[PDB]
């Protein structure tokens, strides 16, 4: 197929990897979590257009603003911890092991 | 109604011309005799083609030609 | 090169995803992914989406990303290895990927995929006096009725939400 | 109870029991004739409605 | 919380459930887990302390994880099918891009790492609605799909969640935490037959509700989070441990039970689909979910653990409690073997 | 299994050919059984709240069984007519189908051999 | 990795013993790397010296118990000459038990796995004879 | 699960945005236009398994 | 040009139909110079 697909998709996995690969913090996670969104968003775009099909055009729209609604709810999750704990480190996350 | 209108005038008069200006954008389109007249401009707005018809026959009412008389005018578009 | 421009813009997309998804810090991360948004917007203005692009910078690198930052000022303080060496690692796998798409004009990751330039896949049609996309955006009101009701209510909501869990009690 | 009765009534329990077996082989023949071929009332799996198609003449003719 | 607020935001997971089991549409079906979701991330935090921000924060993380794998699959689907019909898929990346997405709504193994964690931080109340109301949806996305659902990929994941949901509750003393390794058998148990009859899969999936929302019920009215403050139910409550009993002995699968009826109807149309080595392995493993029910059971009604002397202050209280429907949810998930061909109505 | 049959009339919980069956008689015992539920649920319910479980609420314990009662009837309702159709989908297919199954020659015993594994 | 396993089944029992003592020792290579995956994954160890110690201990383990596994089926295949009869794979699953418990250093654990994964490769074997299909295709 | 609930009402939710044969603003044609409606007008009323 | 190759039909149909299918950019732009390909595939996207 398209050649640019390939690129699309193989950034939907390096964002995916960085998502489901966490290193400190939990702010870097919702940004592989936006850039999986980006990458979602581009491909969806770059189909629809392809296709001419008019009325899918406004479907990048809904997702990207469901999906900076979902950021926004993230966010305030971050803040809620790092109000918490002082940061937003994974490692502070772990009282439910017991 | 009359003595907390002028009250919330004196207090707030913002918020006052603000939930008027927003409810006549509600009632009044429902009150106007030009609301049809949109509806009429936007679908006499020609962005695609007309594609004609096979006459068959017996289509009195579509014209053969664009300066034929049957058909849908804009005498009102004009005069207003 | 030119007729590649679309390929290029979707490279550079690819090195940025490396580069904030290794993760050297929130900060620089935020940044790898505005530049990433910026290109990946470049690959959308390239197919006739512009509405869709303006979006991007507007809505996306203009309010959310703005919104990351100012929340990652309030998270960590001013002042690798495995970052780095991720880094190389997927810039060697992208233009291992690239070298072989460019000899081979076909290649099989997951899917099979065109070596060419996607510039043969367009169309060869006038819309008019229009924009498709822009008349497909603008029928999110006339149509899209039960979508801008659930869209407009999970904002509503959103809004309670925040202010619900933000409120500590 | 009479031996007439325990009989006869036993014969009409191996009749109702018979025919249930046999109409529950066939329930698993007739699932899996449907299941394999797919021509009858089960696993009608919904396809696309063709009752949502525009058949208006659209912008270009090539269509 | 606001009492109004919370009757909206209920309201509204309610109604991010029905848009996705009612649209045709999958960016309806995608707005629709996003609705969900975000209006029950409050639920959670009802009570403000650092172990609900903590379970809500890593169920953002997995139902955002799984929201966007599932808007990949249905990005691929619009390449290799041009349409948003919520029917079968039209490629196999896809189908297992999507079983794995709904796999990690679920909570069902080896994406069942936060199902126990999170529902360990979050009240009993947002615990039995996640562990009811929320299974509705993507088994309802399954239940749309399943001609295109890889059989391998669901029987793997299957029983997988069948086993780890087995030895999961075996070490375990609190009960949030045995409740999810059990949400986690069962969702094991509903999608193993789910290719082959799933009028079977909604048959357990109802008889699995009703009997968590009989004992999250129960945990309510006795406010026992614990196996061993669950044990001092007898000295106060003593018709509440005839209820645990006949609950857990429920759950556990014996007859003549209620819960014995999903697992014995899945047996019984796995093996018209000649698989007789595949429902016996679920059904030894199954074992496992009633011996850590029957350490329950030992614990609270058939044995009487040492009570301390306050008891006897709350011997004076009655219960104010508004225990909603648990007479009619404990009949229902006990006495309701005699009418198995009931569930012919869910054809 | 019986998804498109139910599919050109959705969420039609009794259709009108339902009616075309024959109701399930208030002596049903399965209709029985569930009014016993609905007793059950008054006796529980009066026995969770140390009320007296035989004596107190006979209101309470006379609308458990008429909401289980008047329940079930439309649940026995719904369980005959799904069965009747799935009887009536499958007498179509064995008719309409003649050559997936054949009429089976009915051996006697007279020609039915079997081998004989003696018990010694 | 299923072609991994047709390529073991492919080739009948007691002709070409290397060959399938090389598939049932990638077999259990693979098996192996899967349970260091995950091992590594769940459990982080204490430097990559020690994860890479511990992956290569649990995939030699399991490519042991494959490789003897192979080896003493094959060889009771030649020696006993009946290729369809899963006594072959009874003393192969035990010898692999054995295998493992000479990993493990323990005897008990040794007799156990000898037993209970003697008796899992005799069904399989029976399920290769019979057809016994534990992900069964749909049909009704 | 699929309550159809729009089939029922008679309400159309989004059955508009499900295929690119839809009636489109300003009577759009899509680049697949003519190939999707033989497609749809093909397996329409078979079934899954005979439409495969 | 496909006359060395062997099994080659000369403009055979990718499509099973006969019906008349629109032609793509790479259909009609395909074996022309690349200033061509620019100006028809990027000229209204590009311009100003
Ligand atoms: C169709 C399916 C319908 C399913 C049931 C729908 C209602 C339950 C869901 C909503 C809910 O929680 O309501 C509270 C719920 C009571 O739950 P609770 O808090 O546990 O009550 C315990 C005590 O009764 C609390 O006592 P109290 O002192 O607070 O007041 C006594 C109260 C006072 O009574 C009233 O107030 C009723 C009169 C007013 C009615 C509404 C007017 C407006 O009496 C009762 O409520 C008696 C129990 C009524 C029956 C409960 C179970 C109903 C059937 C459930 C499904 C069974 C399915 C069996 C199938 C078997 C095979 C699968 O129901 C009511 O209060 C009203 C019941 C109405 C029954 C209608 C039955 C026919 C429906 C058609
Ligand atoms: C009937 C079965 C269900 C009854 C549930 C309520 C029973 C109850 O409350 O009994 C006590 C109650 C008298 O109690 P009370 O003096 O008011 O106060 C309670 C005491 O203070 C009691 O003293 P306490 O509470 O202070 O402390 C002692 C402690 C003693 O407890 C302990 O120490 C803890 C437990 C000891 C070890 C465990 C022993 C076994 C207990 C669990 C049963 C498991 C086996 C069940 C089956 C196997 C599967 C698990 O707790 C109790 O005794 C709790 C009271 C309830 C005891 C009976 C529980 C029965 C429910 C469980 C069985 C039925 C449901 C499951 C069925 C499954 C399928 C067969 O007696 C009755 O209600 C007897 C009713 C007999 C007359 C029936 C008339 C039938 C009329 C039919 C025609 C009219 C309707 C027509 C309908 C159709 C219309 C179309
Ligand atoms: C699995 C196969 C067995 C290998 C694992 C053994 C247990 C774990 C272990 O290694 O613990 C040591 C170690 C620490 O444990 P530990 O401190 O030694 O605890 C033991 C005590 O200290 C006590 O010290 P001990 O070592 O002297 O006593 C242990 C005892 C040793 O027992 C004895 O020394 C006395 C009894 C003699 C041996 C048992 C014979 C049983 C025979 C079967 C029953 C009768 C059949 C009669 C048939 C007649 C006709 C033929 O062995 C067991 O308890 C193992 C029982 C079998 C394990 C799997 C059971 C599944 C049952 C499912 C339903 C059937 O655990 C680990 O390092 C964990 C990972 C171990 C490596 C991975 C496991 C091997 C996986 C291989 C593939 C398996 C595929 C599935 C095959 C089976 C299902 C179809
Ligand atoms: C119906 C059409 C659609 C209407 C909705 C669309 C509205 C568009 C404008 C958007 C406004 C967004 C924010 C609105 C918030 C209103 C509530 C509010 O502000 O209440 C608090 C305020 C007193 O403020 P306080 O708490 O003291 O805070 C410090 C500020 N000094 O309290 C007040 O100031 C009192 C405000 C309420 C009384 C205002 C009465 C206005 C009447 C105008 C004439 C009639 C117009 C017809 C429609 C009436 C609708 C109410
Ligand atoms: C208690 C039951 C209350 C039922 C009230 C009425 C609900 C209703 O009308 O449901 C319609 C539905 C049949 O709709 P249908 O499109 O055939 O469903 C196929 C999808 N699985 O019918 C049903 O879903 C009936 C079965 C409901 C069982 C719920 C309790 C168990
Ligand atoms: C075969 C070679 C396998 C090499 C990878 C696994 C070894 C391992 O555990 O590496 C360690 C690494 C964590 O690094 P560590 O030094 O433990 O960090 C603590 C902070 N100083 O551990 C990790 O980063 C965990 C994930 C490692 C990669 C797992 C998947 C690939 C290897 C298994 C399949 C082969
Ligand atoms: C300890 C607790 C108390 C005891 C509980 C009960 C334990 C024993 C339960 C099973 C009884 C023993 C096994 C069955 C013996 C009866 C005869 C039989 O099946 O022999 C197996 C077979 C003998 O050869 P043959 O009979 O010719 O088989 C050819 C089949 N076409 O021999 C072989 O083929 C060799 C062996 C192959 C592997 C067999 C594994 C399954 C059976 C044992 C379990
Ligand atoms: C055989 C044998 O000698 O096993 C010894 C072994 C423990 O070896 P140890 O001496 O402790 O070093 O012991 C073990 O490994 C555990 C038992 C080995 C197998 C015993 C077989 C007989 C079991 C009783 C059967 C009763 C019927
Ligand atoms: C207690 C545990 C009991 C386990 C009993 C297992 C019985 C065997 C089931 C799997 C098996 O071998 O099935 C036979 C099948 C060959 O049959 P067939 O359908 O012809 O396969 C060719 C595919 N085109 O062969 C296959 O499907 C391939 C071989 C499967 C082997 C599975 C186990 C391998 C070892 C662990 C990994």
Redesign the pocket.
């Known amino acids: 197929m398209s050649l640019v697909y390939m690129n699309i998709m193989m950034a939907f996995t390096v964002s995916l990897t960085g998502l489901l690969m966490y290193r400190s913090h939990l702010m870097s996670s919702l940004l592989c979590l936006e850039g999986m969104m980006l990458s979602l968003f581009i491909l969806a775009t770059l189909m629809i257009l392809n296709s001419h099909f008019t009325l899918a055009s406004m479907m990048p729209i809904i997702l990207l603003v469901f999906a900076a609604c979902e950021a926004a709810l993230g966010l305030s999750l971050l803040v809620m911890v790092s109000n918490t704990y002082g940061t937003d480190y994974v490692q502070n996350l772990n009282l439910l092991q017991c | 109604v009359a003595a907390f209108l002028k009250n919330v005038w004196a207090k707030e008069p913002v918020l006052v011309a603000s939930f008027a200006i927003a409810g006549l954008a509600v009632i009044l389109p429902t009150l106007s005799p030009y609301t049809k007249y949109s509806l009429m401009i936007n679908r006499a707005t020609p962005y695609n083609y007309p594609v004609p018809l096979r006459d068959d026959g017996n289509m009195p009412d579509v014209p053969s030609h664009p300066q034929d008389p049957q058909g849908p005018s804009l005498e009102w578009l004009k005069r207003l | 090169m030119m007729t590649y421009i679309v390929f290029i813009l979707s490279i550079i997309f690819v090195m940025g995803f490396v580069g904030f998804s290794s993760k050297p810090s929130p900060i620089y991360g935020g940044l790898g992914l505005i530049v990433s948004g910026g290109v990946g917007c470049g690959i959308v203005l390239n197919f006739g989406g512009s509405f869709l692009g303006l979006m991007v910078f507007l809505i996306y690198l203009g309010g959310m990303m703005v919104v990351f930052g100012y929340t990652t000022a309030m998270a960590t303080e001013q002042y690798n290895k495995v970052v780095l060496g991720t880094f190389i690692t997927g810039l060697l796998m992208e233009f291992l990927m690239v070298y072989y798409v460019l000899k081979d004009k076909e290649v099989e990751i997951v899917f099979k995929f065109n070596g060419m330039g996607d510039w043969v896949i367009y169309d060869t049609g006038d819309s008019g006096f229009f924009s498709e996309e822009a008349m497909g955006i603008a029928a999110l009101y006339s149509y899209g009725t039960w979508l801008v009701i659930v869209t407009g209510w999970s904002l509503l909501i959103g809004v309670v939400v925040i202010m619900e869990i933000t409120r500590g009690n | 109870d009479a031996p007439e009765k325990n009989y006869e009534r036993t014969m009409a329990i191996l009749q109702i029991e018979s025919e249930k077996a046999e109409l529950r082989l066939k329930e698993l023949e007739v699932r899996r004739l449907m299941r394999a071929k797919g021509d009858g009332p089960w696993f009608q799996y919904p396809t696309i409605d063709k009752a949502l198609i525009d058949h208006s003449p659209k912008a270009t003719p090539d269509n | 919380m606001n009492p109004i607020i919370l009757i909206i935001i209920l309201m509204t997971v309610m109604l991010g459930t029905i848009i996705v089991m009612i649209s045709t549409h999958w960016l309806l079906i995608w707005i629709g887990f996003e609705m969900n979701m975000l209006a029950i991330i409050p639920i959670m935090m009802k009570k403000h302390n650092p172990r609900a921000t903590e379970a809500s924060t890593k169920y953002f993380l997995t139902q955002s994880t799984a929201s966007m794998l599932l808007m990949m699959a249905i990005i691929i689907n619009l390449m290799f099918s041009g349409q948003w019909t919520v029917m079968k898929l039209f490629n196999p990346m896809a189908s297992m891009l999507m079983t794995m997405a709904l796999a990690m709504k679920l909570g069902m193994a080896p994406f069942h790492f936060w199902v126990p964690e999170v529902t360990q931080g979050i009240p009993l109340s947002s615990g039995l609605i996640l562990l009811t109301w929320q299974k509705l949806a993507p088994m309802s996305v399954l239940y749309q799909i399943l001609p295109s659902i890889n059989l391998d990929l669901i029987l793997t994941l299957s029983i997988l969640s069948i086993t780890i949901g087995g030895w999961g509750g075996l070490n375990q003393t609190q009960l949030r935490k045995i409740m999810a390794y059990s949400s986690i058998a069962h969702m094991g148990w509903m999608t193993a037959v789910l290719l082959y009859n799933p009028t079977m899969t909604l048959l357990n999936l109802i008889i699995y509700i009703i009997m968590t929302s009989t004992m999250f019920t129960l945990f309510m009215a006795n406010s026992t989070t614990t196996t061993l403050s669950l044990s001092h139910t007898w000295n106060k409550a003593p018709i509440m441990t005839i209820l645990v009993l006949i609950t857990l002995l429920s759950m556990g699968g014996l007859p003549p039970l209620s819960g014995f009826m999903p697992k014995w109807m899945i047996i019984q149309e796995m093996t018209k689909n000649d698989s007789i080595i595949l429902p016996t392995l679920m059904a030894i493993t199954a074992l496992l979910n009633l011996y850590f029910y029957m350490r329950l059971t030992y614990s609270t009604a058939l044995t009487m653990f040492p009570s301390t002397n306050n008891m006897k202050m709350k011997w004076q209280f009655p219960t104010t409690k508004?225990?909603?429907?648990?007479?009619?949810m404990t009949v229902?998930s006990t006495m309701?073997l005699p009418?198995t061909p009931?569930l012919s109505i869910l054809e | 299994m019986m998804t498109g049959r139910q599919a050109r009339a959705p969420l039609q919980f009794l259709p009108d050919e339902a009616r075309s069956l024959p109701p399930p008689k208030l002596t049903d015992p399965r209709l029985a059984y569930?009014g016993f539920?609905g007793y059950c649920?008054?006796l529980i319910?009066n026995a969770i709240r140390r009320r007296p479980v035989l004596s107190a609420?006979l209101?309470?314990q006379f609308?458990?069984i008429?909401?289980?009662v008047?329940?079930?009837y439309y649940?026995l309702k719904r369980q005959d007519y799904m069965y009747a159709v799935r009887d009536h989908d499958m007498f179509s297919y064995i008719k309409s189908h003649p050559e997936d199954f054949p009429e089976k020659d009915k051996k006697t015993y007279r020609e039915v051999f079997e081998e004989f594994h003696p018990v010694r | 990795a299923k072609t991994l396993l047709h390529q073991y089944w492919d080739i009948p029992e007691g002709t070409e013993c290397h060959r399938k003592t090389y598939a049932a020792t990638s077999i259990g290579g693979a098996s192996g790397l899967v349970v260091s995956a995950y091992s590594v994954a769940l459990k982080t160890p204490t430097s990559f010296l020690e994860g890479v110690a511990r992956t290569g201990r649990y995939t030699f383990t399991a490519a042991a118990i494959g490789a003897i596994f192979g080896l003493t089926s094959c060889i009771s295949a030649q020696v006993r000459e009946k290729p369809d009869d899963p006594l072959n794979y009874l003393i192969g699953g035990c010898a692999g038990g054995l295998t493992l418990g000479a990993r493990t250093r323990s005897y008990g654990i040794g007799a156990a796995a000898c037993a209970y994964m003697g008796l899992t490769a005799a069904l399989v074997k029976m399920g290769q004879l019979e057809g016994w299909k534990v992900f069964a295709e749909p049909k009704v | 699960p699929f309550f159809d609930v729009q089939k029922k009402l008679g309400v159309d939710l989004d059955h508009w945005m499900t295929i690119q044969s839809a009636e489109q603003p300003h009577r759009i044609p899509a680049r697949c236009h003519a190939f999707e409606k033989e497609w749809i007008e093909c397996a329409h009323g078979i079934g899954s398994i005979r439409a495969e | 040009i496909m006359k060395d190759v062997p099994g080659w039909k000369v403009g055979e149909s990718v499509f099973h139909t006969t019906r008349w299918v629109t032609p793509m950019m790479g259909e009609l732009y395909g074996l022309r110079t690349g200033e061509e390909i620019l100006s028809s595939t990027y000229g209204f996207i590009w311009y100003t």
């Open positions: 508004r225990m909603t429907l648990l007479p009619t229902l309701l009418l009931i | 569930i539920l649920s008054g319910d609420g209101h309470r609308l458990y008429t909401s289980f008047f329940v079930g649940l």
